[PDB]
Amino acid sequence: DTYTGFCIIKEGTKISKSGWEVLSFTTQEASGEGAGNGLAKCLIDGDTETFWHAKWQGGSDPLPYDIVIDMKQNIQIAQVELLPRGRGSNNPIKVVEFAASEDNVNWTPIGRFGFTNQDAALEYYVKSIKARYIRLTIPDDGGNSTVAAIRELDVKGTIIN
Amino acid sequence: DTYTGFCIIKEGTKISKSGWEVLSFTTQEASGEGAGNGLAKCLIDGDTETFWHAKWQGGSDPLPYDIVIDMKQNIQIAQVELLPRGRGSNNPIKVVEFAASEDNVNWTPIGRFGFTNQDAALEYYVKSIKARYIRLTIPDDGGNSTVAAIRELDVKGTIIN
Ligand SMILES: [Mn+2]
Ligand SMILES: [Mn+2]
Fold first, then answer.
1. How far apart are CA A155 and CA A148, in angstroms?
2. Residue A64 carries which DSSP code?
3. Collapsing DSSP states into helix, strand and coil, what is residue A42?
4. Where is the F5/8 type C domain (chains A, B) (predicted)?
5. Which of A53, A68, B89, B153 shows its CA 20 to 30 Å from the CA of A18?
6. How many Å apart are CA B42 and CA B37, to the nearest integer?
7. Checking DSSP bridges between strand A108-114 and strand A65-84, what pairing results, if any?
C-alpha cells in the first residue's frame, strides 16, 4: 500500500480528450441550455461554447453532484483545469473536489479547491497520481448551490504507457 | 520549469547497486578502518561489514562532507535507507541531507533528516524525483562532528527507462 509525500512535478501538457467517456453523472441539463448543450459530456468535448449545467429546468437534483470520466489510459495527473461558465453568469460554485482511480472502484481524493466564476481557466494543483478515472464532484458542504455550470475540464500531465 | 507538490508514491523496491560509481567524496578513511574498508565506495557495495568513515587517522577534514553517486540510470527515487555503523559505535551524526540531479550540474535537495546511530536501517522519506545522481551530505550546521560512518546507502523506487 501507498502514502502521500512531496514530489518534484513538472507543469504538464494538456491530454487532449478525443475518445474520453463521461461514464456516470449525478445531474445534467438535457434541455434548458441548448439541446446539444448542458450535458455532462459538454465538459470533455473540444467546445468552449458548450458547458455542463446541473438539471434546473422542470426539476433539479439535490447536492452533491459528481461526474466520472474514463481517460481511456493510465496518466500521471499533474494539474486539472476547469473553464467556468463565466461571461457574467450566475454560477455560484464556491467549492469543487477531485478524486482519481486506476480501477473505477477504489477512489483517492486529489484535492478540494475554491471555485471562482472567472472567464479564464482555473489551474488546480491536484495531488499527482497515476490514474485513468477522474471524478469531478460539487460537494454538499461548500456553500455550493444547485446552480453549477462548467465549459470544459482539462488534465495536464504525462501519458505513461 | 518545475515545482514541489504532493504525490501518491508507493513504498518502492531497493535498486540493487551492482554498477553504481561514487564519483566524488569530501573525505574517506583509506587506513584506520580496514584497508578494503572505510572508503566512500564501502557505502554502495553489497557489504554490511564494510562502512564509509570520514578521514580521522593522521588528519581529518572539516565539515561539511559529501558523496555523489551515479546510479547509471534515471530512477523515480521514493525512499533512501542509511545503514548506520551502530553496534555501540561513537558515530555522532546528528543530521544528514540528500540532493539529486539528472545531469550532475543542477542539484535539487530532497530533504534534511535526523540521524540516529541505531543498528537497523534508517528509512528516509525523501521528496521523490526522477534522478541518476544522489549526493549524501553531512552538513556544517547540524551539531554534526568529523566522526561520521555509514555501512550502506540504499535507494527504494522504480527504474523508469
Ligand atoms: Mn465544452
Ligand atoms: Mn558496506
1. 20
2. P
3. helix
4. 7-158
5. A53
6. 6
7. unpaired
Resolution of the determined structure in angstroms stands at 3.0
Whole-angstrom distance, CA of residue B97 vs CA of residue B55: 19
Technique behind the model: X-ray
Kindly report the backbone phi and psi dihedral angles of residue B43, in degrees, each rounded to the nearest multiple of 5, phi listed first: -75, -35
CATH classification (class only), B1-161: mainly beta
DSSP A152: E
* Amino acid, res. B161: N
Please tell me whether the peptide bond between B64 and the residue prior to it is cis, using omega within 30 degrees of 0. yes
Residues making up chain B, counted from first to last: 161
In angstroms, the separation between the Cα of residue B29 and the nearest Cα of chain A is 35
CB contact under 8 A, B7 and A130: no
**Amino acid residing at B18:** S
Give CA–CA dist A126/A111, Å, rounded. Answer: 5
For A15, which DSSP code?
A: -
Please count the CA atoms within 13 angstroms of the CA of A62 that sit on its side-chain side: 2
What residues have CB less than 8 Å from A143, skipping those under 6 apart? A94, A95
Determine contact, residues A110/A137, Cβ cutoff 8 Å. Answer: no
Q: For B42, which DSSP code?
A: G
- 3-class DSSP state of A29: coil
Provide, as residue numbers in chain A, all residues whose Cβ is less than 8 Å from the Cβ of B10: 1-2
Reported in sequence order, the residue ranges of chain B that DSSP labels E, i.e. its strands, are 2-10, 13-14, 21-25, 52-53, 65-84, 95-101, 108-114, 122-124, 129-138, 149-158
By CB atoms closer than 10 A (0-12, 13-18, 19+), residue A107 is middle
Record the cell numbers describing residue B156, joined without a space.
527504494
